[PDB]
């Protein structure tokens, strides 16, 4: 069952085997991935988080955000630790209490302390449109229509040696899948369908780093949302998907009645389905419970391109139909040296007092506050415009934005920006050496929103920077409830600070 939009969520720490090897994880009611939350367009969620977390191998701390919920007048419940609120000690408790308007789409929930979302802690966060224009499209949506793609790792987070490469151990698609090494057999998940009908399957990356090779063996995917914002209908046969993204696709039940097999390659790891990696099964009712025996083609033949997407709404592009015409427009030096990312020569390290707490306490440029050179003031009631060019180590980078979606006026791999009808979205992979992927927002919510890779391994590397978007206002738009003042003293008491 799905749960919320009022709900405890009790972060525990347990033994699980998604694919076959036991580990211990963080997780969320339970389970990997965590359970669905989910409500209508406008609700109010109430989710009291309740540490209960005893292993310090994958810190007994831990602070949750809601990827891709705009949190308007509501930073102070965003999560990401040490930018909106010190993290939740183990043993108390948290409610995080916000509203979700003018929203619809699909979410997900994360840590955002460290790397922990890595150990587990990572589940899907849908809000339903009773009035969807898109809705005529399909006939079944709901929890059985969520398919998450998930990195998992054998070391521990925390674990991950320093100066080894990381990589993962399995792919798993909704929560199952075989590893990438000492292969065993162990349960694949099974996406069942009835012939002739038609789903909104909702598709989350909840990786912590690779993006994958998405596609469903002799079936086709019609884009209609891409994180969060409806799109005009787009045919595709793969969808390459970063870290952090969502798309919705309308699957078409009109292959013969039998099994298919889902694929999810990673772009590091294990290369293949060998043993049944990378893999999960669609199938039709009626069919013999056996694997499929379809192949992918060699070559697909309508892969998603980003500049093919369009929003199904009038979105247009804020500001002027030029390079730099915006009220602010910025261009970020994104590099990668000796182990650490940094941002126009800045390396992200979390300061001792969340940037929220420093504002509120009359921190009032940017140059007042901590990190020193990684908190960039925005002006209200502006267009921004924020390059990317990408050529840092490690990439594509899926560069995120808290408090926001974006206009995405140029792509990976194609130097041509669209200043007309781009598709909106919050991760964007800014692509390879000599690209100038750049996005535009307006400044209309007051507060410090975290600009970063999503690549975990990245952001905790330091690949990160904090927009205090309308200082001035921070105050006034965010009034924040006695718990959350609360949460820093007992943070600091705690770790002897
Ligand atoms: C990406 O686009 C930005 C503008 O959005 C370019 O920024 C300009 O950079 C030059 C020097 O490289 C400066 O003289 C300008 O002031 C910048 N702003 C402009 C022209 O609007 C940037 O060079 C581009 N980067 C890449 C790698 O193509
Ligand atoms: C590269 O990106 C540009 C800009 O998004 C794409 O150009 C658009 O192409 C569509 C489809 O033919 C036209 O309707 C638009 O008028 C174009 N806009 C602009 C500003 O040129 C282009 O298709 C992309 N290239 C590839 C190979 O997909
Ligand atoms: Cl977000
Ligand atoms: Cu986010
Ligand atoms: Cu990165
Ligand atoms: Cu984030």
Avoid at 29 to 40: C, D, Q, Y
Avoid at 135 to 144: E, G, H, K, Q
Avoid at 288 to 306: H, K
Wanted: one cysteine or more; proline letters at 8%.
């Amino acid at each position: 069952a799905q749960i919320g939009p009022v709900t405890d969520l009790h972060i525990t720490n347990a033994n699980i085997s998604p694919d076959g090897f036991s580990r211990p994880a963080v997780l969320a009611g339970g389970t990997f991935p965590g359970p669905t939350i989910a409500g209508n367009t406008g609700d109010n969620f109430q989710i009291t988080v309740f540490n209960d977390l005893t292993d310090p191998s994958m810190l007994t701390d831990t602070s949750i955000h809601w990827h891709g919920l705009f949190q308007k007048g509501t930073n102070w419940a965003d999560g990401p630790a040490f930018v909106t609120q010190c993290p939740i000690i183990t043993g108390q408790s948290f409610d995080y209490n916000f509203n979700v308007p003018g929203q619809a789409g699909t979410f997900w929930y994360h840590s955002h302390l460290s790397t922990q979302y890595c150990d587990g802690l990572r589940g899907p966060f849908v809000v339903y449109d009773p009035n969807d224009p898109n809705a005529s499209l399909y006939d079944v949506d709901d929890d059985t229509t969520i398919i998450t793609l998930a990195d998992w790792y054998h070391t521990l987070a925390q674990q991950e040696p320093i100066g080894a490469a990381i990589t993962a151990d399995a792919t798993l698609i909704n929560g199952l899948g075989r590893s990438f090494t000492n292969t065993t057999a162990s349960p694949l998940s099974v996406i069942t369908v009835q012939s002739g009908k038609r789903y909104r399957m909702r598709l989350v990356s909840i990786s912590c780093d690779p993006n994958y090779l998405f596609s469903i063996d002799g079936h086709d995917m019609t884009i209609i949302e891409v994180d969060g914002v409806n799109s005009q209908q787009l045919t595709v046969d793969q969808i390459q998907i970063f870290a952090a993204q969502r798309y919705s696709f309308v699957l078409n039940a009109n292959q013969p009645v039998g099994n298919y097999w889902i694929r999810a390659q990673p772009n590091s790891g294990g290369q293949g389905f060998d043993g049944g990696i990378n893999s999960a099964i669609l199938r039709y009712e009626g069919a013999t419970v056996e694997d499929p025996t379809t192949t992918a083609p060699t070559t697909f033949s309508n892969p998603l391109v980003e500049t093919d997407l369009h929003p199904l709404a009038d979105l247009g592009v804020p500001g002027q139909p030029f390079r730099g015409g915006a009220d602010d427009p910025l261009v970020l030096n994104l590099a990668f040296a000796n182990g650490r990312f940094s941002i126009d020569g800045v390396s992200f390290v979390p300061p001792t007092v969340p940037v929220l707490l420093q504002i509120l306490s009359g921190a009032q440029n940017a140059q007042d506050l901590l990190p020193a050179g990684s908190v960039i003031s925005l002006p209200s009631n502006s267009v921004i415009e924020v390059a990317l060019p990408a050529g840092a180590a490690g990439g594509p980078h899926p560069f995120h934005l808290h408090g926001h979606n974006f206009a995405v006026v140029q792509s990976a791999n194609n130097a041509t920006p669209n200043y007309v009808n781009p598709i909106w979205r919050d991760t964007v992979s800014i692509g390879g050496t000599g690209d100038n992927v750049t996005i535009r927002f307006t400044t209309n919510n007051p507060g410090p929103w975290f600009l970063h890779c999503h690549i975990d391994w990245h952001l905790e590397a330091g690949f990160a920077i904090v927009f205090a978007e309308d200082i001035p206002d921070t105050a006034s738009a965010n009034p924040v409830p006695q718990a959350w003042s609360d949460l820093c003293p007992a943070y600091d008491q705690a770790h002897n600070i």
